[PDB]
Design an enzyme around this catalytic site. Structure first.
Site, mmCIF file in Angstrom:
data_model
loop_
_atom_site.group_PDB
_atom_site.id
_atom_site.type_symbol
_atom_site.label_atom_id
_atom_site.label_comp_id
_atom_site.label_asym_id
_atom_site.label_seq_id
_atom_site.Cartn_x
_atom_site.Cartn_y
_atom_site.Cartn_z
ATOM 1 N N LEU A 102 0.822 -1.205 0.000
ATOM 2 C CA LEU A 102 0.000 0.000 0.000
ATOM 3 C C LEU A 102 0.858 1.257 0.000
ATOM 4 O O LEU A 102 0.540 2.232 -0.690
ATOM 5 C CB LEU A 102 -0.935 -0.005 1.209
ATOM 6 N N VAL B 276 10.348 2.519 12.180
ATOM 7 C CA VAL B 276 9.333 3.386 12.762
ATOM 8 C C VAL B 276 9.270 3.229 14.273
ATOM 9 O O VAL B 276 8.772 4.120 14.967
ATOM 10 C CB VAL B 276 7.954 3.112 12.126
ATOM 11 N N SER C 12 -6.925 -1.556 10.140
ATOM 12 C CA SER C 12 -7.480 -2.701 9.436
ATOM 13 C C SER C 12 -8.938 -2.868 9.832
ATOM 14 O O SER C 12 -9.383 -2.357 10.861
ATOM 15 C CB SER C 12 -6.709 -3.990 9.745
ATOM 16 N N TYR D 176 -2.895 -8.341 16.285
ATOM 17 C CA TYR D 176 -3.105 -7.447 15.154
ATOM 18 C C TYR D 176 -4.334 -6.577 15.371
ATOM 19 O O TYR D 176 -4.301 -5.361 15.135
ATOM 20 C CB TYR D 176 -3.246 -8.279 13.880
ATOM 21 N N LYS E 126 -4.461 -2.442 15.644
ATOM 22 C CA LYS E 126 -5.265 -1.649 14.718
ATOM 23 C C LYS E 126 -6.395 -0.928 15.443
ATOM 24 O O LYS E 126 -6.713 0.224 15.121
ATOM 25 C CB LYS E 126 -5.804 -2.544 13.603
ATOM 26 N N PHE F 292 -6.535 -6.636 0.345
ATOM 27 C CA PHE F 292 -5.899 -6.012 -0.803
ATOM 28 C C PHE F 292 -4.843 -6.938 -1.385
ATOM 29 O O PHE F 292 -4.208 -7.715 -0.666
ATOM 30 C CB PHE F 292 -5.264 -4.673 -0.427
HETATM 31 N N1 LIG Z 1 -2.363 -6.333 2.971
HETATM 32 C C1 LIG Z 1 -3.613 -6.254 3.395
HETATM 33 O O1 LIG Z 1 -4.537 -6.862 2.864
HETATM 34 C C2 LIG Z 1 -3.911 -5.304 4.494
HETATM 35 C C3 LIG Z 1 -5.175 -5.151 4.945
HETATM 36 C C4 LIG Z 1 -5.428 -4.293 5.962
HETATM 37 C C5 LIG Z 1 -4.399 -3.575 6.504
HETATM 38 N N2 LIG Z 1 -3.150 -3.714 6.045
HETATM 39 C C6 LIG Z 1 -2.057 -2.898 6.605
HETATM 40 O O2 LIG Z 1 -1.658 -2.030 5.590
HETATM 41 C C7 LIG Z 1 -0.268 -1.708 5.734
HETATM 42 C C8 LIG Z 1 0.392 -1.819 4.387
HETATM 43 O O3 LIG Z 1 1.228 -2.980 4.385
HETATM 44 P P1 LIG Z 1 1.077 -3.926 3.127
HETATM 45 O O4 LIG Z 1 -0.275 -4.538 3.129
HETATM 46 O O5 LIG Z 1 1.524 -3.182 1.928
HETATM 47 O O6 LIG Z 1 2.157 -5.024 3.483
HETATM 48 P P2 LIG Z 1 3.692 -4.890 3.127
HETATM 49 O O7 LIG Z 1 4.477 -5.788 4.011
HETATM 50 O O8 LIG Z 1 3.816 -5.023 1.657
HETATM 51 O O9 LIG Z 1 3.955 -3.381 3.546
HETATM 52 C C9 LIG Z 1 4.533 -3.142 4.840
HETATM 53 C C10 LIG Z 1 5.725 -2.245 4.660
HETATM 54 O O10 LIG Z 1 6.188 -1.814 5.960
HETATM 55 C C11 LIG Z 1 7.587 -1.874 5.980
HETATM 56 N N3 LIG Z 1 7.985 -2.013 7.363
HETATM 57 C C12 LIG Z 1 7.689 -3.063 8.183
HETATM 58 N N4 LIG Z 1 8.163 -2.915 9.389
HETATM 59 C C13 LIG Z 1 8.798 -1.688 9.358
HETATM 60 C C14 LIG Z 1 9.490 -0.968 10.337
HETATM 61 N N5 LIG Z 1 9.650 -1.407 11.575
HETATM 62 N N6 LIG Z 1 10.001 0.233 9.991
HETATM 63 C C15 LIG Z 1 9.825 0.655 8.736
HETATM 64 N N7 LIG Z 1 9.191 0.064 7.733
HETATM 65 C C16 LIG Z 1 8.694 -1.119 8.113
HETATM 66 C C17 LIG Z 1 7.907 -3.094 5.147
HETATM 67 O O11 LIG Z 1 9.263 -3.045 4.775
HETATM 68 C C18 LIG Z 1 6.942 -2.882 3.985
HETATM 69 O O12 LIG Z 1 7.498 -1.982 3.043
HETATM 70 C C19 LIG Z 1 0.263 -2.645 6.822
HETATM 71 O O13 LIG Z 1 0.301 -1.942 8.052
HETATM 72 C C20 LIG Z 1 -0.815 -3.726 6.849
HETATM 73 O O14 LIG Z 1 -0.872 -4.394 8.092
HETATM 74 C C21 LIG Z 1 -2.879 -4.574 5.037
#
Ligand SMILES: NC(=O)c1ccc[n+]([C@@H]2O[C@H](COP(=O)([O-])OP(=O)(O)OC[C@H]3O[C@@H](n4cnc5c(N)ncnc54)[C@H](O)[C@@H]3O)[C@@H](O)[C@H]2O)c1
Length: 255
Positions: A16, A59, A149, A162, A166, A195
């Site tokens: 995302l 972060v 989420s 999780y 959230k 997603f």
């Molecule tokens: N994928 C889904 O369907 C979904 C649904 C609901 C919510 N989310 C949330 O949306 C967000 C987007 O993640 P995503 O779905 O693209 O997964 P993703 O793993 O592709 O993206 C997560 C990103 O966070 C970075 N990251 C992780 N830990 C980190 C840290 N400590 N410091 C800095 N960067 C860090 C990772 O390197 C990665 O680039 C996440 O928080 C995820 O939990 C995702």
RNA sequence: GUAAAUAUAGUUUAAAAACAUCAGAUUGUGAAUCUGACAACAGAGGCUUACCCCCUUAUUUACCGAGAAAGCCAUGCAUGGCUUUC
């Protein structure tokens, strides 16, 4: 338009965050992908062009985020938008009677640290950075958009930690919006559903098909481009503040 | 209607496997499994160890009566028409 805006996108090397960075830079904005050093974010930043830079940062670490924001300020001169997309997922039951297995405290603690504590760390530091920006004609200094989420509302079996993180983001959205209202910084949260990101596309094809069928309409996994579109819509609308928007296609997760 | 062929009861190729089907499993990400259910090559009848046939339905394909011999007429030894015989 969002031309000239500077966006700090945490977790911007994948999923995302990467989609948001791609869309925003495509519209003419400048992006800082704040991500882990070994996440391959430098390749994405180079692929996105000159208006995108990479900040290797955790972060959950105050010093790393401070250095990332210093790099962003030096490179582009300010910060206008912040998108908290960094996060990790963990599946683990609270307690399994048949196996006598208990949820580990380390898993809960690390999920909290990455998601909730990391989001707050980024939020506070980037709010400090935005406070230096001259208010625009509308009196706004910046916008902060967090990724929650739908697990914050109907989390399933094994999503205790999780869902806790959230739900913490959801609960803290409004207080932070009220805190930063005098400063003129809008705070918003997007609660995506399912997603098509590396967090889900790594599953077996049958599981992906089932998940797609579980979405009422459209019966498919959400496109990260849709998340980027909603992020831009929040950025452009000056009256969206302290609200959580469910971008999930009307799905309600089963137990 | 009469002769031929053909007939896989989830599907296909073979002459038994693969893909499938139903029940149970709160599965730590190979459950890509484990425990079970089902397993009939169109339907019925013998007969010699084994040696195949006969029959009934279903699908597709094609579907019931003039040889020669002799005498005459016309055409260019051959052809057409007729007369008597089996
Ligand atoms: N994928 C889904 O369907 C979904 C649904 C609901 C919510 N989310 C949330 O949306 C967000 C987007 O993640 P995503 O779905 O693209 O997964 P993703 O793993 O592709 O993206 C997560 C990103 O966070 C970075 N990251 C992780 N830990 C980190 C840290 N400590 N410091 C800095 N960067 C860090 C990772 O390197 C990665 O680039 C996440 O928080 C995820 O939990 C995702």
């Amino acid at each position: 338009s969002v031309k000239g805006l500077v966006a700090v996108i945490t977790g911007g090397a994948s999923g995302l965050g990467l989609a948001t960075a791609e869309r925003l830079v495509g519209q003419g904005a400048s992006a800082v992908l704040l991500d882990l050093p070994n996440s391959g974010g430098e390749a994405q930043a180079k692929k996105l062009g000159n208006n995108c830079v990479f900040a290797p940062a955790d972060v959950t670490s105050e010093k790393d985020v401070q250095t990332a924001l210093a790099l962003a300020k030096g490179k582009f001169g300010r910060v206008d938008v912040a998108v908290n997309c960094a996060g990790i997922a963990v599946a683990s039951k609270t307690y399994n009677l048949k196996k006598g297995q208990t949820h580990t405290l380390e898993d809960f603690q690390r999920v909290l640290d990455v998601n909730l504590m990391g989001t707050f760390n980024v939020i506070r530091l980037v709010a400090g950075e935005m406070g230096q920006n001259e208010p625009d004609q509308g009196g706004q200094r910046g916008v902060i958009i967090n990724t929650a989420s739908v697990a914050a509302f109907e989390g399933q079996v094994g999503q205790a930690a999780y869902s806790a993180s959230k739900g913490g983001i959801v609960g803290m959205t409004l207080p932070i919006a009220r805190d930063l209202a005098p400063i003129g910084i809008r705070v918003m949260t997007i609660a995506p559903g399912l997603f098509g990101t590396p967090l889900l596309t790594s599953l077996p094809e049958k599981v992906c098909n089932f998940l797609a069928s579980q979405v009422p309409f459209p019966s498919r996994l959400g496109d990260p481009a849709e998340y980027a579109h909603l992020v831009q819509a929040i950025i452009e609308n000056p009256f969206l503040n302290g609200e959580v928007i469910r971008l999930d296609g009307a799905i309600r997760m089963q137990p």
